[PDB]
């Protein structure tokens, strides 16, 4: 972690990646007062799509 960072670049500039275990989905309960993370999540996918209109 020293020697002028000649071979070990310890400067944090960007994550360059995010572990999938770090991003989780939670929901608001019926009362909406407390957030609850769903128990035992293993896979999450978020799909966003936009339609295309042809004006050729």
């Amino acid at each position: 972690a020293f020697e002028e960072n000649l071979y070990c670049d310890y400067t944090p500039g960007a994550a360059k990646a995010v572990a999938g275990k770090d991003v989780i989905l939670a929901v608001f309960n019926a009362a909406g007062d407390k957030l609850l993370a769903v128990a035992g999540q293993q896979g999450l996918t978020v799909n966003r799509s936009k339609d295309s209109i042809e004006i050729t």
Binding site: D51, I53, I55, T56
Partner: protein
């Protein structure tokens, strides 16, 4: 790039320029609706054709409107509906063929809302005369600076075309696809000034217009459609009531009974 020009109240409006959010995608024109006046005799085969006629047809323009927001979309739709639909018929033409114009009436066309800000449209104009006509009449010079003539208007690339004559025998070239007949609600004007008793003969058609009074050089004889006048005064009682017509291509004209003839033809070309 495609655009549509509308002549309304003597003003030329570009559809794209008037409405920035509206752009013309494509234009198209229905083929001439030929119709033969069939007569059937029972027991025989086929029909006996009468005189071929042409029914009114449709000129279509596919376009789209892209607005900034929903209130802008509604306002643009309302303004387009106000602009397109008028009390009386107007004129339209396109960038693709800017030398040919149609006298049309709009038809009911509904906006197809695809998203919150975009809407497709297919405007349809009914042309009821059954034919298309040139933007300029025969009196307009065939010069580049007039910016009126285009290719494909049947202009003869073998000889000069002028419609003002100073002699008693000449040729006039009707470049249209139809025989110009004022009885068929066609536009045709003749202005002749001369001295004597005049008589105009269309040899190719075989027609003859006869005026039975002396004329001076200061008096202009004007035949508009089916009305002959001198100094804008109806003199139909003093004529033979004949009317001349312009056949397709060249027509040989001969003028008898007057001298120092100055005759000018003013008519549009009939296309289809």
């Amino acid at each position: 790039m495609s655009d549509l020009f509308l002549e309304l109240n003597g003003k030329v409006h570009s559809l794209s320029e008037t409405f920035p959010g509206l752009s013309v995608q494509e234009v198209s024109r229905q083929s001439p609706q030929l119709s033969m006046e069939t007569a059937e005799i029972a027991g025989t085969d086929g029909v006996i054709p009468g005189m071929t006629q042409f029914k009114p047809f449709i000129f279509s323009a596919k376009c789209n409107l892209q607005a900034l927001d929903i209130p802008d979309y509604h306002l643009a739709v309302r303004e387009i509906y106000e602009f397109l639909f008028q009390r009386d018929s107007y004129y339209i033409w396109s960038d693709q063929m800017p030398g040919i114009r149609y006298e049309v009436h709009p038809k009911p066309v509904d906006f197809s809302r695809e998203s919150d800000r975009v809407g497709l449209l297919t405007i349809e104009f009914d042309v009821f005369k059954g034919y298309a006509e040139s933007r300029g009449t025969s009196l307009d010079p065939m010069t580049f600076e007039v910016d009126l003539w285009q290719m494909g208007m049947n202009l003869s690339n073998r000889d000069d075309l002028f419609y003002v004559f100073r002699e008693n025998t000449f040729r006039v070239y009707n470049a249209g696809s139809d025989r110009v007949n004022p009885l068929m609600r066609h536009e045709l004007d003749i202005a002749m000034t001369a001295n004597g008793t005049p008589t105009i003969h269309n040899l190719t058609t075989g027609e003859s217009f006869e005026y039975r009074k002396e004329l001076q050089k200061t008096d202009v004889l004007l035949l508009n459609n089916i009305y002959p006048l001198v100094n804008n005064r109806r003199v139909g009682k003093d004529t033979n009531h004949g009317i001349i017509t312009l056949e397709k291509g060249w027509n040989d004209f001969e003028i008898k009974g007057v001298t120092d003839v100055t005759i000018a033809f003013n008519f549009p070309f009939i296309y289809r």
